[PDB]
Scaffold this motif. Structure first.
Motif, PDB file in Angstrom:
ATOM      1  N   UNK A   1       0.828  -1.197   0.000  1.00 33.26           N
ATOM      2  CA  UNK A   1       0.000   0.000   0.000  1.00 33.26           C
ATOM      3  C   UNK A   1       0.868   1.255   0.000  1.00 33.26           C
ATOM      4  N   UNK A   2       1.995   1.190   0.709  1.00 31.99           N
ATOM      5  CA  UNK A   2       2.910   2.322   0.799  1.00 31.99           C
ATOM      6  C   UNK A   2       3.416   2.738  -0.579  1.00 31.99           C
ATOM      7  N   UNK A   3       3.979   1.788  -1.325  1.00 28.55           N
ATOM      8  CA  UNK A   3       4.485   2.083  -2.660  1.00 28.55           C
ATOM      9  C   UNK A   3       3.370   2.638  -3.536  1.00 28.55           C
TER      10      UNK A   3
ATOM     11  N   UNK B   1       1.050   8.083  -6.070  1.00 27.19           N
ATOM     12  CA  UNK B   1       0.005   9.091  -6.121  1.00 27.19           C
ATOM     13  C   UNK B   1       0.588  10.501  -6.014  1.00 27.19           C
ATOM     14  N   UNK B   2       1.455  10.707  -5.025  1.00 19.97           N
ATOM     15  CA  UNK B   2       2.081  12.010  -4.811  1.00 19.97           C
ATOM     16  C   UNK B   2       3.102  12.307  -5.897  1.00 19.97           C
ATOM     17  N   UNK B   3       3.808  11.269  -6.316  1.00 21.38           N
ATOM     18  CA  UNK B   3       4.833  11.391  -7.344  1.00 21.38           C
ATOM     19  C   UNK B   3       4.248  11.852  -8.674  1.00 21.38           C
ATOM     20  N   UNK B   4       2.924  11.925  -8.742  1.00 19.53           N
ATOM     21  CA  UNK B   4       2.240  12.363  -9.953  1.00 19.53           C
ATOM     22  C   UNK B   4       1.445  13.640  -9.681  1.00 19.53           C
ATOM     23  N   UNK B   5       1.496  14.082  -8.437  1.00 13.68           N
ATOM     24  CA  UNK B   5       0.820  15.298  -8.026  1.00 13.68           C
ATOM     25  C   UNK B   5       1.872  16.280  -7.539  1.00 13.68           C
TER      26      UNK B   5
END
Length: 37
Positions: free
Chosen positions: A19-21, A26-30
């Motif tokens: 779940x962590x990865x 998600x953030x790495x794309x925001x």
């Protein structure tokens, strides 16, 4: 408190990582071009 669950939890710890990865992606794309990076 020592030793509560068997080898089961050993995988549970890994369960969360999955779940962590998923989260970082998600953030790495925001955080890669949301608006004014």
């Amino acid at each position: 408190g020592s030793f509560t669950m068997n080898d089961t939890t050993v995988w549970i710890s890994v369960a969360v990582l999955s779940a962590v990865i998923c989260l970082i992606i998600v953030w790495a794309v925001a955080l890669k071009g949301y608006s004014m990076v």
